[PDB]
């Protein structure tokens, strides 16, 4: 390291943290995304939403 390179060493060479949530007081607040079939079949059954009076009658 040169006098100048050394300040940049810290900023560039030394690895940065990829997981910084401490697993607490914060934690994995983002990793809980909903499980839902990511767009089901909307054919057989859609009429109970838009044509409901017909189903009830």
């Amino acid at each position: 390291l040169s006098g100048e390179a050394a300040a940049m060493y810290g900023d560039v060479v030394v690895q940065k943290t990829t997981r910084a949530c401490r697993k607490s007081e914060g934690g994995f607040k983002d990793v809980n995304t909903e499980l839902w079939g990511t767009s089901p079949y909307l054919g057989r059954g859609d009429g109970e939403v838009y044509n409901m009076p017909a189903s009830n009658q």
Partner: protein
């Protein structure tokens, strides 16, 4: 004279009991309820039914709500009286619940055998056995039909009945795995029973049919249901025969607000054997006679309440490397936690620790959130298994920190967690709020 001699004797200590009264016990006000009818019909099962086979059924959307689902089996017993032990739930090796092809829960035959060890109590557990075993000293060749009720989030309270009205797109289905070996039916110990018949099964689904004022409501309003899940994977233990009490740290890998943890130790070759075998009444085949052997249970009596034959000496649970509570001996988790939390009797070899005041209910009452906890561990200490199982003088006459030499076979550890999640139904699309 008479009751009025008590009634008129009103005083200072009654001002907080009957002064300015709020309720009267002798006129009930009843609530009027929405019209519905209960109907259960058979579903069609896909796949070949048999030992070791996997089958599934997709639930026809004939009803509005799904409540109880019962899996019906017919079996012929392949052995003599006392050779079976809840064979109906052994056969139902597991069941997986999906809503629209997305996992909600999954239960295993050992759980079913652990659930009635913990939560199903009095008459219903005896009746449960009546629905799952041969309980009248029946002989080989006897055939009967069995009723194995499922215990998913939606069947034990109508309040969580599964909403088909509002689940226009996610079709609900069940996957079943059938056991390759059922004791006293297909196998006797490790030996196949020649001529044993294949089981036949059907699934009954209890549909609720609603009227038009409320059925309209269901289809139009969003819903969020607070539901339960079971978390599970197994592990093995080290159980010493002599000179030491072994320790074992079993790392917990659970998520979500957990109402309780429960576990058992068993011999994986004998379904429901959670204690050591011994040459005492009901504790092994032939017990009390010259023909007694302590390697095979007298199966119909596999369950016992004699904790002396249980392997566990003590257990402690740590939260983020710190003690969650001080170490307890094994009989605490077998007798006291279920006394304080459930109100039944837990058989020896099955243990529960609650975080909840009343885990048997569905109203949340205290939970441990294992998704915000760095690590948690179940630290076990075992009894020294130095007692000759064949000598009643030693089996029935020793100290707490020792148990029978046959306890060394109880190598299978099953740790269950029972938690909460939220089922969201939005404009016909269903799924779960948290995936952890």
């Amino acid at each position: 004279a008479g009751g009025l001699s008590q009634l008129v004797a009103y005083g200072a200590q009654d001002v907080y009991l009957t002064g300015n009264p709020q309720i009267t016990f002798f006129k009930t006000v009843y609530r009027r309820y929405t019209n519905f009818a209960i109907e259960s019909i058979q579903q069609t099962i896909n796949g070949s039914v048999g030992f070791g086979n996997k089958v599934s059924t997709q639930i026809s959307r004939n009803g509005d709500l799904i409540t109880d689902i019962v899996v019906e089996f017919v079996l012929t017993k392949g052995g003599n009286g006392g050779t079976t032990y809840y064979p109906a739930e052994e056969l139902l090796q597991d069941v997986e619940l999906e809503i629209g092809g997305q996992r909600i829960d999954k239960h295993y035959n050992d759980w079913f055998r652990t659930y009635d060890a913990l939560f199903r109590m009095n008459d219903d557990r005896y009746n449960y056995r009546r629905m799952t075993d041969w309980v009248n000293n029946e002989l080989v060749g006897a055939q009967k039909r069995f009723y194995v009720p499922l215990i998913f989030f939606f069947n034990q309270t109508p309040g969580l009945a599964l909403p088909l009205i509002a689940l226009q797109y996610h079709e609900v289905k069940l996957y079943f795995t059938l056991a390759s070996q059922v004791q006293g039916v297909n196998y006797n110990g490790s030996s196949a029973i020649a001529g044993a018949a294949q089981p036949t099964m059907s699934v009954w689904v209890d549909y609720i049919f609603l009227d038009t004022q409320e059925r309209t409501r269901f289809a139009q309003l969003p819903h969020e249901y607070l539901i339960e899940q079971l978390q599970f994977t197994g592990s093995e233990t080290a159980t010493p025969s002599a000179t030491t009490q072994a320790s074992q740290n079993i790392r917990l890998n659970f998520n979500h607000p957990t109402k309780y943890l429960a576990w058992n130790f068993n011999n994986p070759t004998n379904y429901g054997q959670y204690t050591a075998l011994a040459n005492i009444p009901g504790a092994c085949s032939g017990a009390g006679t010259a023909a007694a052997t302590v390697t095979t249970p007298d199966y119909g009596n596999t369950g016992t309440y004699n904790e002396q034959l249980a392997v566990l000496d003590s257990a402690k649970i740590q939260l983020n490397g710190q003690d969650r509570f001080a170490t307890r001996k094994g009989s605490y988790f077998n007798k006291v936690q279920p006394y304080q939390s459930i109100g039944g009797v837990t058989p020896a070899g099955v243990y529960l620790y609650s975080f909840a005041l009343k885990p048997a209910g569905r109203q949340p009452s205290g939970t441990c959130n294992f998704s915000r906890i760095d690590n948690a561990t179940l630290s076990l200490t075992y009894k020294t298994c130095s007692i000759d199982a064949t000598s009643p003088a030693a089996v029935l006459g020793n100290t707490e920190t020792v148990t029978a030499n046959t306890a060394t076979l109880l190598t299978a550890l099953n740790i269950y967690a029972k938690n909460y999640n939220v089922l969201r139904i939005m404009s016909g699309m269903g799924g779960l709020a948290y995936a952890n």
